[PDB]
Write an enzyme that holds these catalytic residues in place. Sequence first.
Site, mmCIF file in Angstrom:
data_model
loop_
_atom_site.group_PDB
_atom_site.id
_atom_site.type_symbol
_atom_site.label_atom_id
_atom_site.label_comp_id
_atom_site.label_asym_id
_atom_site.label_seq_id
_atom_site.Cartn_x
_atom_site.Cartn_y
_atom_site.Cartn_z
ATOM 1 N N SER A 181 -77.100 12.154 11.018
ATOM 2 C CA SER A 181 -76.580 12.568 10.018
ATOM 3 C C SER A 181 -75.458 13.789 10.195
ATOM 4 O O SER A 181 -74.579 13.593 10.975
ATOM 5 C CB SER A 181 -77.706 12.893 8.824
ATOM 6 O OG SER A 181 -77.366 13.391 7.578
ATOM 7 N N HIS B 1 -74.693 8.083 8.260
ATOM 8 C CA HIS B 1 -74.946 7.507 7.059
ATOM 9 C C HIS B 1 -74.303 8.153 6.002
ATOM 10 O O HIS B 1 -73.738 9.393 6.148
ATOM 11 C CB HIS B 1 -76.369 7.156 6.791
ATOM 12 C CG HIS B 1 -77.247 8.353 6.547
ATOM 13 N ND1 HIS B 1 -78.788 8.615 6.408
ATOM 14 C CD2 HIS B 1 -76.661 9.684 6.068
ATOM 15 C CE1 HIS B 1 -78.849 9.674 6.185
ATOM 16 N NE2 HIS B 1 -77.844 10.632 6.154
#
Lengths: 178, 177, 178, 181, 183, 177, 178, 183, 180
Positions: free
Chosen positions: E85, E110
Amino acid sequence: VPTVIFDIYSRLLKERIVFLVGPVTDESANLVVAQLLFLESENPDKDIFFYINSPGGSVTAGMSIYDTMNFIKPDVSTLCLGQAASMGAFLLSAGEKGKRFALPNSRIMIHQPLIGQASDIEIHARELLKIKEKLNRLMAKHCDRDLADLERDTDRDNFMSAEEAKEYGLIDQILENR
Amino acid sequence: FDIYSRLLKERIVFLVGPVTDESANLVVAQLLFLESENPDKDIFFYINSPGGSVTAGMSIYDTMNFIKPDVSTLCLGQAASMGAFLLSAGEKGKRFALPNSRIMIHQPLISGGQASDIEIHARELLKIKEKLNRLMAKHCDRDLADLERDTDRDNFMSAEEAKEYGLIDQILENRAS
Amino acid sequence: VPTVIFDIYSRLLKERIVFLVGPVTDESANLVVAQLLFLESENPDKDIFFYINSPGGSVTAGMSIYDTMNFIKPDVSTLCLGQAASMGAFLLSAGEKGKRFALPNSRIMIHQPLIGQASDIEIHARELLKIKEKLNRLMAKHCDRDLADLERDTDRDNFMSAEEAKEYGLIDQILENR
Amino acid sequence: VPTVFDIYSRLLKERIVFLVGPVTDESANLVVAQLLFLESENPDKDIFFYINSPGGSVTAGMSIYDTMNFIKPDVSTLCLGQAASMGAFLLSAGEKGKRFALPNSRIMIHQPLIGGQASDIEIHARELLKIKEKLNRLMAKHCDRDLADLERDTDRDNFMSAEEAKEYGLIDQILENRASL
Amino acid sequence: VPTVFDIYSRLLKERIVFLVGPVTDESANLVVAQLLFLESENPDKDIFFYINSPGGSVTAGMSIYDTMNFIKPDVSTLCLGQAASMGAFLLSAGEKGKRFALPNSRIMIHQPLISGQASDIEIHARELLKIKEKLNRLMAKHCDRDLADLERDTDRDNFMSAEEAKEYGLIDQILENRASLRL
Amino acid sequence: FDIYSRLLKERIVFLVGPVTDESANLVVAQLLFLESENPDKDIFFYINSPGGSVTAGMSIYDTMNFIKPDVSTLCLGQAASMGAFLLSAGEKGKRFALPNSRIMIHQPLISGGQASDIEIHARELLKIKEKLNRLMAKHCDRDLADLERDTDRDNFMSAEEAKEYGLIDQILENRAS
Amino acid sequence: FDIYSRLLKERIVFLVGPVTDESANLVVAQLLFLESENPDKDIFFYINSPGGSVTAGMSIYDTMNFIKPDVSTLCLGQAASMGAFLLSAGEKGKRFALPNSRIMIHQPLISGGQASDIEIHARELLKIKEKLNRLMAKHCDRDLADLERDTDRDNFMSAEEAKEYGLIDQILENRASL
Amino acid sequence: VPTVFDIYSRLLKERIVFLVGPVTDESANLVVAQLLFLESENPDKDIFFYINSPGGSVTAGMSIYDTMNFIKPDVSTLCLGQAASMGAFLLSAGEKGKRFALPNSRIMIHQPLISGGGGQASDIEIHARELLKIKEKLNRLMAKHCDRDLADLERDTDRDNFMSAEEAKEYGLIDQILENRAS
Amino acid sequence: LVPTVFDIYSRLLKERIVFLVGPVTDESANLVVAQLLFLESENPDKDIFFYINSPGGSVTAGMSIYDTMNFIKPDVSTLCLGQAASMGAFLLSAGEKGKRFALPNSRIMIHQPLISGQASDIEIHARELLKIKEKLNRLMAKHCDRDLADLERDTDRDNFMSAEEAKEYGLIDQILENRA
Ligand SMILES: CC(C)(C(=O)NCCSc1ccccc1C(F)(F)F)S(=O)(=O)c1ccc(C(F)(F)F)cn1
Ligand SMILES: CC(C)(C(=O)NCCSc1ccccc1C(F)(F)F)S(=O)(=O)c1ccc(C(F)(F)F)cn1
Ligand SMILES: CC(C)(C(=O)NCCSc1ccccc1C(F)(F)F)S(=O)(=O)c1ccc(C(F)(F)F)cn1
Ligand SMILES: CC(C)(C(=O)NCCSc1ccccc1C(F)(F)F)S(=O)(=O)c1ccc(C(F)(F)F)cn1
Ligand SMILES: CC(C)(C(=O)NCCSc1ccccc1C(F)(F)F)S(=O)(=O)c1ccc(C(F)(F)F)cn1
Ligand SMILES: CC(C)(C(=O)NCCSc1ccccc1C(F)(F)F)S(=O)(=O)c1ccc(C(F)(F)F)cn1
Ligand SMILES: CC(C)(C(=O)NCCSc1ccccc1C(F)(F)F)S(=O)(=O)c1ccc(C(F)(F)F)cn1
Ligand SMILES: CC(C)(C(=O)NCCSc1ccccc1C(F)(F)F)S(=O)(=O)c1ccc(C(F)(F)F)cn1
Ligand SMILES: CC(C)(C(=O)NCCSc1ccccc1C(F)(F)F)S(=O)(=O)c1ccc(C(F)(F)F)cn1
């Protein structure tokens, strides 16, 4: 709840007695409304006896009772037992003029209303203030008193004996027995 | 002799996280310390904050304007709510943001009593709202009317947008900027 | 808390600056008292600068600061930053006359006090009422105002800008910069 | 609830249906059931729908709204106490000319109000905005007002007296007693 | 933390800065503080930014990101354990040619994820979508890829091995030991 | 057709447990029901209660005195606080206790706001205290001064002691008593 | 004498709120009862549900298809997730929605153990996802590929969109709408 | 923590590094930091990595594992009390010939296990696939550590597999059981 | 909480339908036992239709139903609707052979026992759990007309089966699609 050959409260509806007990909520107020409408349907031409022992509660829920009292054809006699405070005193003073009663050791109390974004705060404060004023004007009408009297006398909690509530104009008579 | 005291030597003061009485006064104390050490050199006030208490932010604001040093401001991460107010209050010409920092401005927001007390507190809150809009208009060189409209709801701005709005003076990508 | 070659607050005590931040409790008030006594011991003949950002708190804890301010030999200059409300405004107005200051966007607020057996209730209500009156009289003295002014103006929360607090007599000057 | 049959079942025989308190799937479907019951008993008589509600779920309120319009009886509405949010929507949905408020009741209208990946948030934000516009367009139709009026007037909480509600078009008449008709 | 002036303070003298665990305002600003300190100590020497993080706040991660790009030292980055992330974002943000990963570390990318009135929901959804787009564009730049690739590849959680992250363009080399370094 | 409705036919009404608005109004409703059925026959009000709300107790008290039937009272287990007040309010000559029941009397006891509001509520509470002492003195055929002193703190009494005090009229061991 | 039992005499069955084992079996029981009372009359299955358990939904679904009466369905309020599945499962030509109801469809959603066990349950969930897409495609007279694409994330549909999609047959504003 | 500075820093001077209790990002990185400090202090002397752990996070253990293999010093491992799960993985990763257990310590190996956790089936499919990649990866790495067939590790980690020091020695997870230095 | 037509479940009991819905507990299992005994009393010459939608529950509670199904004279036909997992699948597989049914989209799941002091006491309760595991695998092999080793293998972890897979395994006899 005792039964008798229905429950105790439905038995007393045969005397056309309706109770308000404890806090005024939408649910408890609407139960009073439904009993008022039922008794009017049973006989529109006989008085109703609304016995009030309540500390107050929701303004709008109380207004649902208030407007129903004035809408239906039967006179709604009111009786304070224990206490009628806040919206309970309001409904007590709303009984048919000359038919508002208190038991000798009950008490009455009247007061002004009590309870996001700045914009929302402004909105809720304004409606609260309108309620404040609306309550004061309707109470002054009930009591045959000046609005400015009610404004002064509801600024903080104002407890009254049955005698004081009578002199104030919230009730008509103190009843000790039949 | 932690890292933050070490950067305090460089006249860097951080505000990180919510603005509370305690975190604001920690900033105030550092501003007064730096003025005492050198009233004639700039202070670099690095802000990464979501906002918090108006009055605690005002304690920082008025200290920034009171002390002799220019308080340069720098937005890193974000300056939202009272964080953007403080960022916009840096010495004019010396308000900065990093290229991917963001700014958010909005009207006051609150989390009982008699109607009399609600009235008093609603009115004080409206005075605060007006005061912040007036001060922010002064910071951004905009009409009060612009700020009143633009803070009705959460208003997120990129570093470029905050520059164009008037909230900061330059975007710094590196020193050569 | 940053250190410098001691902590940031002890460094500012070298400027004779004492902070009151957040609610007034016995513990936070007594920390202020101890700094006042320390600075008087360091040099009884120099002013102290008491910077106040507080929402109020305990009356008795505030009185411990108040009486210490008046007991020690140094003049205690006061400064409002952020806000001085309730006991915080009280201490602000208690600074040496002519040395009470507020930053331009700080605010002041003043109000009356706010919080078993019937006998005990009587006891606590009576002491609360005495506090109410004592606070009003001391504030009127601080403000060079009539007691009845303070009684009227502390009945509910009374927010004041720095200018309004100056006109009221709670502070002497608004300082924008040196 | 006084019982012998309780008080609400007795008034249901008078064709009175109450909506009291928050609008939920369960409270709304109880209203729907009573509406369908009264239609089946007599499809040609009015129903009297008494509302004292702060609002609640949109989809639950929609189940009442479409039933009100589906069934053959005219559904008369009465505001007692208050009709807020979806309560006000249902009040304004009564048969035109038969929407009523008691003299000290109040009405309030406002826009909708309530995690995931950003893709999911986008979908649900879009759906909430479609709901917002659908309810402003349906309300404008009820009030014989413009969509732009309702968008302005529901941006934040908009409290109305019975008279203000009548002038706006949300109700037809204020009833102090039957002689008001 | 052993006090040998503790262990991390000792390694700071080697110009090594760690990000361990979630990216918050507090942990991000501690990284920023250290980056500024090492630039002040010597502006012409590389910094080694060791990342083992599942991600955290976007805005807090951007404070590190813009600091890495602002200071004069090259910030070399190293994935140990994982960089997921915003951890993966900062890893890919290291000085091009000096972005590394250990052989059994993993990377994950993501789109943004989040754990009022409709007007306010609209404003915040729009801002979240702006954030999503900005991150995809910045990542496409770091990886020298089309924006469309990143849009496809962050729709759901995208786990990559060190070799997959290198072929994606997210890191430059995998280092098993010092002898691994090339170029 | 539960046991309690069955004894309601015997004109027995129970108050069991704390006096609340709800339990008191249940008693009030039964008193009114019994007066409706027969205004000219005694009611037997059996009290086993630790007390509870003053105003809820007052609703029972004033109904007892309002309705035509004599309300005979009987203490079983205990009558404490508003329970003793109600017991002492039975029709004079018809107040009873079982031999091992006990009675307790005391001044009002409460579980915020501005000093103005505390003042108002302290004064109302003192009016209640005085009123209860005055009414209890009337019930017991005692001077007000006796009650004021004797309720300063919890005052436990056996059935005999409550009889001698004036709170009840007779102790009933069985019917032959 | 309760109202839902009364409406059962019109052959109306409601599903309200979340689909659980308990609420689904209650639907099953009413469907079996109505078939037993008259196996040659339609049943009217009114759905206002946000969804819930897939296996509990399947007990209703298979019961709808097992019994002899046609099961007409009606969306009121909303039919989401397994609520939409059951709506679409009504006898073709007899699936309806009220004009302001909404439909929503999506893939399976779960709100621990060894990797072996997580593997097992992940695979069962993917079988369920494919079974629901295939069955819904059949209900809507659409491709498997359409449903796979259109349930990847929450897919809200107005009544007109649901009709266009093939999930329902007609929108009923009132009885004249049929 | 006694201060004679503190006891663990004192033992660091003897090149002893402890892993005690669960492997988290924070406890793993403290080990990485000490391993790098000891390499910096002398890159040719062995490091003694004492392990008493029930396991913990896979990626956190991978940060230590890759660091052990990256640095020049041999990392000798010693099991005291227990090395279970990722603790057992790290025990088996010590320099071959220098992997030790005390005589009443225990070892336990098992496949990956998720505490509890959520989401759409697409998301659950992604994470179940990543978990199975991790299960395979750990089995292959352990097979190599133990000089055994992959199929052995798959069979022997299906459920919790407790091993005495002698069983772990026989397995190839450790090299020797040390009762004292004369061993 | 249940439509009255007394109530709808009592009404279907007139049709000799008994439901097991949700977890098998002592209380829900004894209610099933009571209904079976009642239906035997009312007419021992008619089948009982035992409809199962259950995730499982207590082994001993399940055994009270199982032994009652086998004790009474009426055949207990079983029907899986929604799902029959764990003890639910056990009871489904226990119906009178030839009269065990599943609706087309129901699912069955079978697995080994699963639970959520002193070492002596641990040993005792672990031995009892393994006896229960072995008894259930043997009894299930008998219901399925399968070898015990099959069941031992196929219940080691959760084993989800479609209606067709359950029929092939031997757990049910027929899949029923409609009333004709
Ligand atoms: C009834 C009381 C509890 C009241 O305010 N209820 C509901 C307020 S709802 C509310 C809440 C938050 C935000 C906005 C609102 C809204 F605006 F919607 F109201 S009152 O206690 O204050 C009261 C009134 C009158 C009297 C008298 F009779 F004695 F005269 C005594 N008491
Ligand atoms: C700072 C915030 C959190 C705030 O209101 N703090 C003080 C609340 S205390 C309070 C509570 C009850 C009654 C009265 C009070 C009081 F009197 F004290 F206020 S703000 O979110 O509202 C905000 C405002 C403006 C901006 C801008 F700068 F962008 F322009 C950003 N943020
Ligand atoms: C300080 C406040 C919180 C206060 O009452 N503290 C302690 C009371 S202790 C107490 C509690 C229970 C029972 C008895 C007692 C006791 F009797 F012991 F006190 S005050 O808020 O009310 C306040 C006072 C003055 C001002 C002004 F300056 F603006 F003028 C503002 N605020
Ligand atoms: C009804 C309200 C509570 C509402 O939004 N209910 C349900 C929303 S469900 C939801 C939740 C999360 C994610 C997605 C969703 C979904 F998309 F599914 F909805 S409303 O208060 O906002 C409202 C509407 C209209 C009026 C008016 F009549 F005055 F005009 C007043 N109030
Ligand atoms: C960082 C994460 C945790 C994040 O969303 N932080 C803060 C959100 S802000 C927010 C939320 C609600 C309302 C308003 C707001 C606000 F206005 F504040 F924005 S992220 O994990 O989702 C993420 C980002 C990027 C990547 C990539 F690199 F892999 F590409 C991976 N993950
Ligand atoms: C009944 C008790 C519980 C009581 O006080 N109830 C009412 C409290 S509500 C209240 C709360 C706050 C502010 C104001 C009020 C209010 F205005 F409403 F009072 S008593 O214990 O005090 C008691 C008194 C007397 C006797 C005797 F009969 F023996 F003589 C026995 N018991
Ligand atoms: C029903 C939903 C809640 C679902 O998954 N229920 C039960 C799963 S049970 C479970 C839990 C843990 C481990 C294993 C399992 C098991 F494997 F046993 F299932 S669904 O929301 O996901 C869904 C499905 C279809 C639709 C459509 F109709 F729109 F198409 C909408 N929604
Ligand atoms: C380390 C353990 C705790 C582990 O799984 N950590 C990773 C969690 S991250 C996660 C969370 C949710 C969803 C997906 C994920 C992700 F996919 F990212 F993983 S393990 O106990 O399972 C274990 C493994 C091996 C051994 C052996 F060495 F002996 F062989 C012993 N123990
Ligand atoms: C029934 C289940 C929940 C179970 O264990 N119940 C009994 C708990 S009692 C207990 C508690 C503490 C200590 C000792 C004990 C005792 F020893 F007494 F049990 S089972 O799910 O595990 C299961 C078994 C078999 C099957 C199959 F059919 F598919 F084959 C499916 N499921």
